[PDB]
């Protein structure tokens, strides 16, 4: 229970599954140029209005 299950679960397995899930969220793009430039517009709007990088 400790040293095949829980000490394996808390540090390495949960971190591996979290990086797996974030890897699947990054690279699940549909290859659509419309969506990438629409995200670029949302980026520039957040940088101006929300993050004040032009100030």
């Amino acid at each position: 229970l400790l040293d095949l299950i829980w000490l394996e679960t808390i540090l390495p397995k949960t971190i591996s599954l979290a990086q797996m899930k974030m890897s699947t969220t990054i690279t699940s793009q549909k290859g659509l140029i419309k969506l990438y430039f629409l995200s670029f517009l949302i980026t520039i709007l957040i940088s101006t209005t929300l993050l004040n990088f032009h100030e």
């Binding site: 699940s28 969506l35 629409l38 995200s39 949302i42």
Partner: protein, 140 residues
Amino acid sequence: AKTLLHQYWDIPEGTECHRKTYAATSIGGASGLVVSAYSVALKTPTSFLEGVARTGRYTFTAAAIGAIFGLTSCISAQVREKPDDPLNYLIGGCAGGLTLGARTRSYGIGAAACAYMGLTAALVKMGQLEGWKVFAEPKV
């Protein structure tokens, strides 16, 4: 969104709970709106109502995380009478982690989010105490 962080961090811990909870809610809601905007950007919803449903779900999820975080941290600083103490933000971060687990309708996500968001909120409180800079200005 820098003014959201200023109107959060100006208040001492365990003094004015409604404005702490509302400011943390507004920070979390701004974060949820940013996540919602990139989510409806890169992943096209099938309808306009689907898009506003995803936006409302993510924004209310992160705003409820911020609400229960700020509430639990300020109430713990009231009832424990130690304002300069990162254990209050550890408790608030676990409350926000259980909030994220209750919104995702799963227990193990809630336990992982409790642990890591509580450690992250404790680290943010220690950075407020010792003056840790993440975007440190170039000096040498």
